């Protein structure tokens, strides 16, 4: 006999722990079809970088990362064609990709000392920002890079979004590789207001009592927030390609998209299912007002190492 396997390549975010949504959903797979599911995590960029590296002789069939890292392995042909199931259910999913759990950016502010939430872009520039902000840094933290992204679209153009980090350069405290220890900074009031993404912060309010979560708006009154999945296809030429679509098709079924926000704190994709956790009302109600956009990625995947570079330049300088 052999042990069945599939192997999934991810993004961080879904298996932090026993009760994750890839633990519980894996563990439920398994069961149902004899099929063990090999794991390995890391960077969107470092997954979608090791399938280039092992191209010749694949060893996942399953990839999970969050944009521009799913356009650039569809650009790079390591993704197989594949129609889903689902996907009548499932917004925006093509034959190479498909949308598996929604995410934001988002930021937070200190609750106990600023009465309340800053109200706009300008506002962040304001004195009393001095030292006391901070967001990460972009290429080397994903909700840095998604911050920076932010600020194009808010400000409707690169040369105006980089003017205008220029500006938040003389409050930013500094860079940071990563973005989740912010929180506490926020929490202490070390800073007043930091980046984040929707899905971590939600799950750090319980033990950061004085900090929310908040957008800012831009002169034209609109609060809106980068939509940033996690991302699924099937890999090219993968050793276990059967079992890999069985996965997806079982990771976008209603079945395990229900309890996507319980487990993960993630928004499911399918619009079918209707969470029963509190997760997802606190999720909502952070969302309320708030305008999802997301750029061209496929644009942006060729675009972004240029563009973090330039951010280096505005503001080092």
């Given at each position: 006999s052999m042990e069945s396997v599939v192997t999934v390549y991810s993004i961080d975010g879904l298996h932090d722990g026993d009760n994750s949504w890839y633990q519980v959903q894996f563990d439920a797979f398994t069961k149902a079809t004899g099929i063990t599911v090999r794991y390995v995590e890391g960077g969107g960029g470092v997954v979608v970088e090791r399938l280039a590296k092992e191209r010749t002789n694949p060893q996942a069939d399953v990839l999970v990362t969050a944009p521009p890292f799913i356009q650039r392995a569809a650009a790079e042909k390591l993704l197989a064609n594949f129609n889903t199931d689902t996907a009548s259910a499932i917004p925006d999913a093509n034959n190479l990709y498909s949308p598996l759990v929604k995410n934001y950016l988002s930021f937070i502010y200190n609750s106990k000392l600023l009465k309340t939430a800053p109200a706009s872009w300008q506002d962040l520039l304001d004195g009393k920002f001095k030292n006391k902000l901070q967001y990460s840094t972009p290429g080397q933290a994903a909700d840095g890079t998604?911050?920076?992204?932010?600020?194009?679209?808010?400000?409707?153009?690169?040369?105006?979004?980089?003017?205008?980090?220029?500006?938040?350069?003389?409050?930013?405290?500094?860079?940071?590789?990563?973005?989740?220890?912010?929180?506490?900074?926020?929490?202490?009031?070390?800073?007043?207001?930091?980046?984040?993404?929707?899905?971590?912060?939600?799950?750090?309010?319980?033990?950061?009592?004085?900090?929310?979560?908040?957008?800012?708006?831009?002169?034209?009154?609109?609060?809106?927030?980068?939509?940033?999945?996690?991302?699924?296809?099937?890999?090219?030429?993968?050793?276990?390609?059967?079992?890999?679509?069985?996965?997806?098709?079982?990771?976008?079924?209603?079945?395990?998209?229900?309890?996507?926000?319980?487990?993960?704190?993630?928004?499911?994709?399918?619009?079918?299912?209707?969470?029963?956790?509190?997760?997802?009302?606190?999720?909502?109600?952070?969302?309320?007002?708030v305008q999802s956009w997301q750029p061209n990625w496929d644009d942006v995947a060729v675009s972004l190492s240029a563009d973090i570079s330039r951010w280096h330049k505005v503001t080092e300088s």
């Open positions: 998604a911050v920076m992204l932010q600020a194009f679209h808010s400000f409707g153009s690169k040369d105006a979004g980089f003017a205008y980090l220029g500006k938040l350069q003389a409050n930013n405290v500094g860079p940071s590789a990563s973005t989740g220890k912010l929180t506490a900074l926020v929490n202490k009031g070390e800073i007043y207001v930091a980046n984040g993404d929707l899905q971590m912060n939600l799950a750090q309010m319980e033990r950061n009592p004085n900090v929310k979560i908040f957008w800012p708006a831009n002169d034209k009154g609109e609060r809106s927030a980068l939509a940033i999945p996690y991302v699924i296809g099937l890999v090219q030429g993968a050793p276990q390609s059967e079992n890999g679509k069985k996965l997806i098709n079982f990771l976008l079924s209603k079945e395990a998209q229900t309890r996507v926000s319980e487990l993960s704190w993630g928004m499911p994709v399918r619009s079918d299912v209707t969470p029963s956790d509190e997760h997802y009302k606190a999720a909502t109600a952070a969302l309320e007002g």
